[PDB]
Each structure stands twice: as structure tokens, then as C-alpha cells.
Paper text:
FabV is the most newly discovered class of ENR. It exists in a variety of organisms, including some clinically important pathogens and serious plant pathogens, such as Vibrio cholerae, Yersinia pestis, Pseudomonas aeruginosa, Burkholderia species and Xanthomonas species.
We successfully crystallised the full-length selenomethionine-substituted xoFabV (SeMet-xoFabV) without removing the N-terminal His tag and the thrombin cleavage site. The density map was of high quality and allowed us to build an almost complete model containing 390 residues (C12-L401) but lacking the His tag and thrombin cleavage site at the N-terminus and A402. Each xoFabV monomer consists of 13 α-helices (α1 – α13) and 11 β-strands (β1 – β11). This β-sheet is flanked on one side by helices α2, α3 and α10 and on the other by helices α4 – α7, which, taken together, constitute the canonical Rossmann fold centre. Unlike the strands constituting the β-sheet, strands β5 – β6 and β7 – β8 form two anti-parallel hairpin structures. In xoFabV, Y236 does not point to K245, and the distance is 10.4 Å.
Residue numbers in the entry: 12 to 401
Write the structure that this text describes.
């Protein structure tokens, strides 16, 4: 999708705001929150849960393209503009930075705003799934991640989303360089640089916590999302989390990876097996009452793991990860997937899966397909908000 609808994006944001408010606005969770990757998907939902679910002041970092009078910007630009407008209306502090989250300049700008505008400290640092290209600070060398298996070719049933057909799709295995570079991009190195910088600047509150988002997914995609090159990066991420946890614990806080569920995203839409699995699991989970989108995931993370009213510590897996893919990875859900997977064809795709839902949710990312938006009305693409351009 090559265009976006600003008002649609605003209504998406308003829908998430309403959803978290409906779960109860709390005042005993985070107060000063930094979200790295704050403009879309899980990052955006985390910002909305923090601000509108917990009344927190927020600073978001993202890389998007601003709109001009004649050309639409990216969805994340309009999402963030909507967030800012409504957060300010709600009397909250809301500031944003548009630029490269991997860069030292982004860290410096964040630190300056925390010191000068936010009261001097943050108590929660959210680290969203990073971009797949990383310019290294100092050297300027650019590393690129690879979503490839290791050791052999990966082949799986998939959807050609341009034709609404079932295909077989294959991915060739990673080189050693691709494995290393994927660790460099999708591992924990930059997350640790952020915590380093914040600590060094004295802007981490006593008790500050950090959470980095991750994903494991289903058995049919294990060779690429759980194992493979990305899997090696996740090992690095998980290792980093436990290192950061010990570090922040010395000051009363902690750190965790939170493994989240499968949801429609721009990134995985490009990987043909994923629209198929997502479509399938959406249908199965909706029937079982277990379906969640980004805002439900983040509300459950905040309310049932990080800031439990019963004051108890969050439950974790063997690697000290928070798991919000708990409902998805139930035997009943996954077994139902296993039963349907071999049956799917072009002729029955829409009937065996929620592929209609997938297509709707994909267009929704960009602000299209809502039932409460007049898409015939004029669109103003030049939208300004409180955002520093690096």
C-alpha cells in the first residue's frame, strides 16, 4: 500500500485510546515513559496504553516521512500526529522525535528532553522491534538483517497477496555474514546503548524498568522466526535483557523481553507464509474468544504483567521472558492450525481462514477500510505536530 489516509489513521488511534480507557484508567503504573519505535504497531499501542491507560507522560522516537500539501506521509506520521493531538487534549506531556533510533543523535536528543521538559527522569523504556537496517554509531558501517533459515532452504505454503492465491514460497539459507549482521541489527546491542546513555546521563528513575518486544510464532515458521538468523539475534536480545535486568535491579528496577502474539504488521506482510498463518490463526482464535490486536496485547502486558494491581511480580518463562503469546500457543489453537494447514488451496482460502480479516487489517494500518470514515471527503496531507526532526 503506497498511500495513507490521515483521518483514518486518527480514527485508528482514537479506537485504541477508547479501548484502553474502557479497561480502566489507572494512576499507579508508569509516569514518565520513553518509547523507542513509537509510531506504529506494538510500539504505538504501548504509547497509548501508557498515556491513556496509565496517564503517563510520553516521549516517542520513530522514523517516518512527513506529509506535504500534495503528498501523503507515512502511516506512522499520521498515527503519531493523532496521538500527539489527543494526548495534549488530555493534558498529558507528549513529545516526539523523527529520526534514526540507532543513532547517537537520537539518544542525545532524548536525554535533553528528559532533562529539560520531563522532570529529569524516565521510569519505563520500551524498545520496539527494531528496523532491519542499522547504521553503526562511530564507524558509520551499515548492517542489514536477513530473515533466512540456517543450514538449509525453507519452504512452506504461502499466499501471494497480490493475487489472493496459494503458492509455495522458499527462502535460501543465511551466510555466516548474514547471521552475524542479523545479530548486530536485531539483537540487543542498540537497546543496551540506550540504557547505557540514559544511565550515564542520570535520567533513569529509581526503579526504572525496560521491556523489549519480541516474537516466536508458530511451528511452521520456526526456521525463520524462532531459529534461523533472526533466532540467533533473539538469543542475543534475550541475553541482553538478562544483563540489563541485573543492572537495573541494582537500582530497584529490571528488564525483560516480552514475547508478543502474531498480529498483522507491515513487515511480515512481505513474507508470504505469514499472511497465511496469521489469517488461519485469527479465524481460530476469534472462534475461541482469544483474539487480540495490538492494543489488547499491550493492555494485557501492562496490566497483567508489568503493573499488576495485586502487586505480584509478572510470570515469566525459563528465560525470564514475559509471554503474551500464551493464548496463541495453546495446544488447542496450534493443533487446529496443524489440522487446517495441509487443506488450504486458492479455492478455499477465504473459507478456511480469516484472509478477509487479514486484508482488512492490512489496509487499516494505512488508515483505509474503516466503516466510520468518509473516504470521499477531502484529505489534508500536511499535518504538523510536536515533533523534532533530527
Amino acid at each position: 500500500c503506497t498511500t495513507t489516509h490521515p483521518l483514518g489513521c486518527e480514527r485508528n488511534v482514537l479506537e485504541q485510546i477508547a479501548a484502553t480507557r474502557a479497561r480502566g484508567v489507572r494512576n499507579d503504573g508508569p509516569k514518565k515513559v520513553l518509547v523507542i519505535g513509537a509510531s506504529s504497531g506494538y510500539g504505538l499501542a504501548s504509547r497509548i496504553t501508557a498515556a491513556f491507560g496509565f496517564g503517563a507522560d510520553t516521549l516517542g522516537v520513530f522514523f517516518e516521512k512527513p506529509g506535504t500539501a500534495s503528498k501523503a506521509g507515512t502511516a506512522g506520521w499520521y498515527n503519531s500526529a493523532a496521538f500527539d493531538k489527543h494526548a495534549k487534549a488530555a493534558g498529558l506531556y507528549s513529545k516526539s522525535i523523527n529520526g534514526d533510533a540507532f543513532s547517537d543523535a537520537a539518544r542525545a536528543q532524548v536525554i535533553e528532553l528528559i532533562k529539560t521538559e520531563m522532570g529529569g527522569q524516565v521510569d519505563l523504556v520500551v524498545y520496539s522491534l527494531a528496523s532491519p537496517v542499522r547504521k553503526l554509531p562511530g564507524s558509520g558501517e551499515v548492517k542489514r538483517s536477513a530473515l533466512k533459515p540456517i543450514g538449509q532452504t525453507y519452504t512452506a505454503t504461502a499466499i501471494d497477496t497480490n493475487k489472493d492465491t496459494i503458492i509455495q514460497a522458499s527462502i535460501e539459507p543465511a551466510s555466516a555474514q548474514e547471521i552475524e549482521d542479523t545479530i548486530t541489527v536485531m539483537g540487543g546491542q542498540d537497546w543496551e546503548l540506550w540504557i547505557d546513555a540514559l544511565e550515564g546521563a542520570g535520567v533513569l528513575a529509581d526503579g526504572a524498568r525496560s521491556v523489549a518486544f519480541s516474537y516466536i510464532g508458530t511451528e511452521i515458521t520456526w526456521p525463520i522466526y524462532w531459529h534461523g538468523a533472526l533466532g540467533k539475534a533473539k538469543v542475543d536480545l534475550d541475553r541482553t535483557a538478562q544483563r540489563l535486568n541485573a543492572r537495573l535491579a541494582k537500582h530497584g528496577g529490571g528488564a525483560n523481553v516480552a514475547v508478543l502474539k502474531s498480529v498483522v504488521t507491515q513487515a511480515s506482510a512481505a513474507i508470504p507464509v505469514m499472511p497465511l498463518y496469521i489469517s488461519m490463526v485469527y479465524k481460530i482464535m476469534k472462534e475461541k474468544g482469544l483474539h487480540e490486536g495490538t492494543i489488547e496485547q499491550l493492555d494485557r502486558l501492562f496490566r497483567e504483567r508489568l503493573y499488576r494491581q495485586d502487586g505480584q511480580p509478572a510470570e515469566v518463562d525459563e528465560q525470564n521472558r514475559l509471554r503474551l503469546d500464551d493464548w496463541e500457543l495453546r495446544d488447542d489453537v496450534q493443533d487446529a492450525c496443524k489440522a487446517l494447514w495441509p487443506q488450504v488451496t486458492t479455492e478455499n482460502l477465504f473459507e478456511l481462514t480469516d484472509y478477509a480479516g487479514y486484508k482488512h487489517e492490512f489496509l487499516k494500518l494505512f488508515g483505509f477500510g474503516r466503516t466510520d470514515v468518509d473516504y470521499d471527503a477531502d484529505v489534508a496531507t500536511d499535518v504538523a505536530f510536536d515533533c523534532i526532526e533530527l
